[PDB]
Nucleic acid binder design. Structure first.
Length: 89
DNA sequence: CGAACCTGGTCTTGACTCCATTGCCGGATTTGTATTAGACTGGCAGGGTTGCCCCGAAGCGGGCG
């Protein structure tokens, strides 16, 4: 389980993210899931920073780092002839 | 016509001074590797549609008897 989790931390993302940032991102996701099931709504980021013993700007930095990239090979418009990369100035 | 002066770039020197360039050192943070001893031991997209090409039974006609 150690080697499988380490390989999932290494190779499962497009841009590479180190192990401790992956750990705190998964911690943030688990705590947000628990607070969503408990409170019933989406938690405030200051409440998340209160829960995770860190600062809300660090919470915002982690939420910025967690954003996976989107692909350029889908169809934006109704017709499939228009790919996504043909509307980027 | 001769002397004194004003002001033109022209150029040196002495002093100031100011800010980049390393450089060291101490600490903070950031990333990478090793380690956790009860037992645990073979999964899941997925099919459906359309069209065309390649091999097998089968008449079957010609060689065979």
């Amino acid at each position: 389980r150690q080697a499988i989790t380490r390989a999932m931390a290494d190779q499962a993302r497009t841009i590479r993210i180190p192990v401790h940032m992956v750990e705190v991102i998964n911690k943030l996701g688990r705590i947000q899931r628990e607070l969503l099931q408990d409170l019933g709504r989406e938690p405030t980021p200051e409440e998340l920073a209160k829960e995770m013993d860190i600062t809300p700007e660090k919470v915002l930095e982690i939420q910025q780092y967690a954003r996976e990239p989107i692909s350029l090979d889908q169809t934006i418009g109704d017709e499939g002839d228009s790919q996504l990369g043909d509307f980027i100035e």
